[PDB]
Amino acid sequence: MYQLFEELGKGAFSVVRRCVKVLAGQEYAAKIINTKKLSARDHQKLEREARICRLLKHPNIVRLHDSISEEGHHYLIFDLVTGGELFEDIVAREYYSEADASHCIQQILEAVLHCHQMGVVHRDLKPENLLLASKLKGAAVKLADFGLAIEVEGEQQAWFGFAGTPGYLSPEVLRKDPYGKPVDLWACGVILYILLVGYPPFWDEDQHRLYQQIKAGAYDFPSPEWDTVTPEAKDLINKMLTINPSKRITAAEALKHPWISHRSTVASCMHRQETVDCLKKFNARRKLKGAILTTMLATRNFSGGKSGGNKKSDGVKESSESTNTTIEDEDTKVRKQEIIKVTEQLIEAISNGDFESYTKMCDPGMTAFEPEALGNLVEGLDFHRFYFENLWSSKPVHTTILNPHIHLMGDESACIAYIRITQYLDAGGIPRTAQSEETRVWHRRDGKWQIVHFHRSGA
């Protein structure tokens, strides 16, 4: 049904690859899940993932087109979005302000609101799920991958399992409390915070300490970098990073927050280069950590240095004549003889009065000096046509070529000079003979020898 092309990204248990629907000629992203490596339970919950993704129809959410299981693999086929990660894109931009982060978060919150309205909680919102629709300027931000998403019943909370990514986990999930929609608003607070200053609100080498920080809500807004962030951006983060999920801002309420809905008078327009710089390192640390590592050694200076031997300039070593003959592309043979071949075919074409073959062997802009031109230079084949039509269209005539000389001037040019002697009969012969000295200038154009100019004397 489909044809797989390049890989676009990975997880521990899936890869994503561009593919083409054979009979459609439409391109898609194939999420390819190795089902041999899943638990029975996670294999079974692919049914829930497939279902959630069909439900969700929103401009800021990538949708499922198809789901296929084979013996060792499951295939979830989605729309192709080609812009890559939002976070990678932010660091390649010429300008990045609070007003620009607000537009990112608004799109994310719109998507999340739509999930919540459909009874879907994502549970694992993180930078990797935030993709751009295309490489075009101002492409939309799109949610991708709902492999840990759950279905909820109205506003009812439950214990759906301990699932998520450490830095984005909500306090209620860490306390083992029944939970629901607010887990996604906590994760949006963490994402918003990273979008503003380029580093996460909660971080610790020790995962147990990290979780105590999260559960305590122990994040801060340190100077210098937070000093130029508006009070309203900080207010929205605070409302999202509220420890008690019953008191946490909802996606609907977040979208009405002035830093989002009154962006044009509230969100700062100042470029935040330090955010861009920190985010680069954040982005890089995210691509080293993972289940499988492509680099052989993890601890390598990322910056590099120049080695010795990088450029080499040698001296003028004394050399001899080195003509660069091209590699031959046909059966090996005598080029001189080749010229003799096309020349004999020329003489035979003139003798037979065959203007058709004479035209092929001559360039359309052929130059000519001949006694029939009375000292003038003739261009084209119109002039010799009069002799092909009248005279040569026919008593016995014998031609004889004497002392031929050939000059080869590269692969595509040659020149032959010879003496032509013609034996013929005039009226009631009386056999006669005539001499002429002829020069032909041949030139191979598109794999065919053609006369570009010729010269005749005494005829």
Is 417 annotated as contributing to ligand binding? Answer: no
Nearer Cβ to a copy of itself (123/453): 453
Task: Give the residues lining the site for a copy of itself (CB under 8 A).
Answer: 294-297, 321, 367, 369, 371, 375-377, 379, 403, 405, 407, 409-413, 415, 417-419, 435, 437, 439, 441, 443, 446, 452-453, 455, 457-458
Is 8 annotated as contributing to ligand binding? Answer: yes
Helices in 198-240 by DSSP H: which ranges?
207-216, 231-240
Nearer Cβ to a copy of itself (222/308): 308
Is 139 annotated as contributing to ligand binding? Answer: no
The answer to whether the peptide bond before residue 430 is cis (omega within 30 degrees of 0) is yes
- Smallest CA-to-CA distance from 61 within 29, 105, 19, 107 is with 107
Is 302 annotated as contributing to ligand binding? Answer: no
- The phi, psi pair for 145, rounded to 5°, reads 75, 110
Based on the residue annotation, tell me whether 124 is a catalytic residue of this protein.
Answer: yes
- The CB-of-249 to a copy of itself minimum distance in angstroms stands at 46
- The CB-of-114 to a copy of itself minimum distance in angstroms stands at 38
Is 62 annotated as contributing to ligand binding? Answer: no
Nearer Cβ to a copy of itself (269/409): 409
Nearer Cβ to a copy of itself (103/443): 443
- The CB-of-314 to a copy of itself minimum distance in angstroms stands at 12
**Cα 444 to Cα 438: distance, rounded to the nearest angstrom:** 20
Nearer Cβ to a copy of itself (72/178): 72
The answer to whether the peptide bond before residue 224 is cis (omega within 30 degrees of 0) is yes
Provide the edge-to-edge strand list for the sheet that holds 141-143: 84-85, 130-132, 141-143
Chain breaks in the chain (C to N over 2.5 A) after: 393
What is the DSSP code string of 41-83?
HHHHTHHHHHHHHHH---TTBPPEEEEEE-SSEEEEEE----S
- The CB-of-57 to a copy of itself minimum distance in angstroms stands at 34
Is 161 annotated as contributing to ligand binding? Answer: no
**Cα 129 to Cα 108: distance, rounded to the nearest angstrom:** 10
- The CB-of-382 to a copy of itself minimum distance in angstroms stands at 16
Is 15 annotated as contributing to ligand binding? Answer: yes
Provide the edge-to-edge strand list for the sheet that holds 73-78: 2-10, 14-21, 26-34, 73-78, 64-69
Question: Of how many residues is the chain composed?
Answer: 459
Q: Which of 124, 227, 277, 314 is catalytic?
A: 124
DSSP 3-state assignment of 313?
A: coil
Binding-site residue set for ATP: 8-16, 31
Q: State the catalytic residues.
A: 124
